[PDB]
Amino acid sequence: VLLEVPFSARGDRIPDAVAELRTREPIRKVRTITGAEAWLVSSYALCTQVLEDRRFSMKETAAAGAPRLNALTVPPEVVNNMGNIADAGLRKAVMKAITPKAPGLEQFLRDTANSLLDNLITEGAPADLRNDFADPLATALHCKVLGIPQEDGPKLFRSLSIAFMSSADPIPAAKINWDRDIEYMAGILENPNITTGLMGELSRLRKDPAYSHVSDELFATIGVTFFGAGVISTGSFLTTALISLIQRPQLRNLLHEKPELIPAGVEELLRINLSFADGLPRLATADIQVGDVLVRKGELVLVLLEGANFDPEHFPNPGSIELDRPNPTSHLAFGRGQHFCPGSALGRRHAQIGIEALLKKMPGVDLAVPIDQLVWRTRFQRRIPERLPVLW
Ligand code: HEM
Ligand SMILES: Nc1n[nH]c(-c2ccc(O)cc2)c1-c1ccc(O)cc1
C-alpha cells in the first residue's frame, strides 16, 4: 500500500526513514489515518516554503469534504482561532497576557518547580517526571497566566488526553469536555474575583465599548484553547526534552555546572524535539509547485517539523546538540509564518526554569527503567511517554 503516516509514536529517536525521504523525495504522497492522501514535506527548504505561503491554508483544512489528517476535536471555526482573535481586535492583548514577563510570573514558576521537586524527593525514587513534574508545572503555569484558581487546573488538564487526540473519527468525549470547559470559562468571565491574567484582561475588555460586539463564545474559546494548547505543548515538550537531557549525561553535567548556557541548550532541545506527532496540516487553495510536485488546489499538505529540523543542509550534524550554532533559533519548533506560535516565549521560559530547577535539585537524575520500557501514547497530536520513571 501507499506509505502511511505517522511512521512512529516514539519521541526518543527519529526514524532513519525520515533522512531517506528527505534525500530521495522531500515531498511525496502518503496516506493518513483517515484514508486520505496527502503530501508529506520533509526538507527545511520545502517546509519553509509551505509555511510562508498563505495559499497553503490552515483555516481551509476544516472545510467539509476536504482530505483530512484526523477528525476535528474543536468546532470548525476554531481552526481559525487566531484569525478570529485578530478580527475581534484582541491579538495584542492576548499576546501581552501570555508573555513570561509579568511581575512575579518567573518567580512563581521557580517556586512551583521547586516545590514539585521537593515533594518527589520527600517521597523517594522512582519519581514520574511527566505526571508529577512536567505536566503539573505546565498546568500551574497556565492557571497563573490565565488568572484562574490553581485548584481548577487538574480538571481542566484531564480533558487533554482526549482533546489532543489524532483520531480517524469524531470523538464523543471531546464534545462533552469542550462544552463543559467552555461553560467554565464563561463562568470565569462573569466572576468578579478574576482580575488578573489573560481571563482578567478579557473580562475587562468584554465590558469595554470597543469590544461590545465580540461574542461571549469567542472570549470563552480563547480561555479553553490557550489553556489546552499551552499545557499540552509545554508539558509534552518539557517531558521529551528531559529524556534528551537524561540521555546526554555530559550535557546534563555542563548545564548543571554552567546554568547560563541553559537558554542555548533549550533552544537545541527545541530544534531536536519530536513532540509533534504529525506534520502540520495545510490545504492548498491554488495549484502551487513544491519541489518536483505540482500540488493541486484542494490537496492536503503535511509539514514535517522534524524533517526540517534535522535537515543537514541547514543544521550540520543534525542529531547532535551543539550550543554554538550560528543559526540557533532558525528551527521550526514553533512553526513559521502567519501561524507562528503565540506562546513561544512562554514555552521557552517554562522549559528553562523547569530544567534549571531539576538540575539543581536532582543533578544525578537518570531513567529508572531501560529506555525501551517507556510507553508511547498512540493516536495523539503529541508524542509522549505515559510515565517517565527516574531516580537521582
Ligand atoms: C514548547 C512549547 C510549544 C511548542 C513547541 C508549540 C508549537 C507550536 C507550533 C509548531 C505551532 C504552529 C502550528 C501550525 O502552524 O500549524 C503553534 C501554534 C499555536 N500555539 Fe504553540 N507551542 C508551544 C507553546 C504554546 C503556548 C504556551 C501556548 C499558549 C499559551 C501556545 C498556543 C498556540 C496557539 C493558540 C497556536 C495556534 C496559532 C495559530 O493558529 O495561528 N503554544 N505552537
Ligand atoms: N488542534 C487542536 N486539537 N485540540 C484542540 C483543543 C484545545 C483545547 C481544548 O479544550 C480542546 C481541543 C486544538 C486547538 C488548540 C488551539 C487552537 O488555536 C486551535 C485548536
Numbering used by the authors: 5 to 396
What does the original paper state about this entry?
In this program against the Mycobacterium tuberculosis (Mtb) cytochrome P450 CYP121 (the gene for which is essential for Mtb viability), overlapping fragments were found in both heme‐binding and non‐heme‐coordinating active‐site positions. Their elaboration via a fragment merging strategy proved highly successful for the heme‐binding fragments, but this was not recapitulated by compounds based on the non‐heme‐coordinating triazolylphenol fragment 1 (fragment 1­ KD=∼1.7 mm, merged fragment series 2–4­ KD=∼1–3 mm). Thorough investigation of the crystallographic active‐site complex, coupled with virtual screening, led to new structural scaffolds that were anticipated to alleviate the internal strain by subtly altering the ligands’ binding pose using a double hydrogen bond with a nearby Gln385 residue.
A clear possibility to enable such rotation was presented by the neighboring Gln385 residue on the opposite side of the narrow active‐site channel. We hypothesized that if an interaction with Gln385 could be strengthened (e.g., by using a double hydrogen bond)4 via subtle structural modification of 4, it could shift the restricted phenol sufficiently away from Val82 and Thr229 to return its rotational freedom, while still enabling 4 to maintain the other important interactions discussed above. The virtual screening results suggested that the 3‐aminopyrazole 5 would make the closest interaction with Gln385. Remarkably, 5 had a KD of 40 μm, 70‐fold greater than the original strained merged fragment 4, and a correspondingly high LE of 0.30 kcal mol−1 NHA−1 (NHA=non‐hydrogen atom). CYP121 crystals were individually soaked with aminopyrazole 5 and its analogues, leading to the successful determination of structures of 5 and 6 in complex with CYP121, both at 1.35 Å resolution. As predicted, compound 5 successfully positions to make a double hydrogen bond with the Gln385 side chain through its aminopyrazole. It also maintains all prominent interactions with the protein identified by 4, including one phenol hydrogen bonding to Asn85 and the other aromatic stacking between Phe168 and Trp182. The Gln385‐promoted interaction moves 5 sufficiently far from lying flat against Val82 and Thr229, such that there is a notable rotation in the originally constrained/restricted phenol adjacent to these residues (corresponding azole–phenol dihedral angles of 30° vs. 65° for 4 and 5, respectively). In silico QM calculations were performed for the conformational energetics of 5, which show that this rotation clearly alleviates the steric clash of the phenol ortho‐hydrogen atoms observed for 4. QM calculations (QM method: DFT(b3lyp), QM basis: 6‐31g**, gas phase) indicate no significant internal strain for the protein‐bound pose relative to the predicted ground‐state conformation in the gas phase (0.4 kcal mol−1).
